[PDB]
Amino acid sequence: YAWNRKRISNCVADYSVIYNFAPFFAFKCYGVSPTKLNDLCFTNVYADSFVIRGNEVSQIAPGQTGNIADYNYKLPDDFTGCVIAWNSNKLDSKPSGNY
């Protein structure tokens, strides 16, 4: 409900260094190939970050319905870019309860 937004502009972006920073399963990108990002280039780049649970990972998609997609965070229908998600049970969990 309070996700940050970082403006990224005037940058030489190498997208092969992301795989050495976080241990994710899939580099899920909708409108562009993940490995083709070096050749083509665009104008403005945005970065968002939030922590959700495992049940509502699939709701971060264009044209999706759910609790998060209606009341927390909604994606546009014509979204292009990359969505990166990975499990964080080793950092965001406590034996007394992470509240």
Partner 1 sequence: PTYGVGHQPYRVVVLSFELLHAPATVCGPKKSTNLVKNKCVNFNFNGLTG
Pick the binder of a second copy from 3, 58, 88, 92 (CB under 8 A). Answer: 58
Query: Which residue ranges make up the site for partner 1 (CB under 8 A)?
Result: 22-25, 51-55, 57, 60, 75, 79-95, 98
Span interacting with a second copy, options 30-38, 43-51, 76-84, 88-96, rule CB under 8 A:
30-38
Cβ–Cβ under 8 Å, residues 46 and 6? yes
Instruction: Determine, following the binding rule CB under 8 A, whether residue 72 of this chain makes contact with a second copy.
Output: no
Q: Which class for 60: exposed (0-12), middle (13-18), buried (19 or more C-beta within 10 A)? A: buried
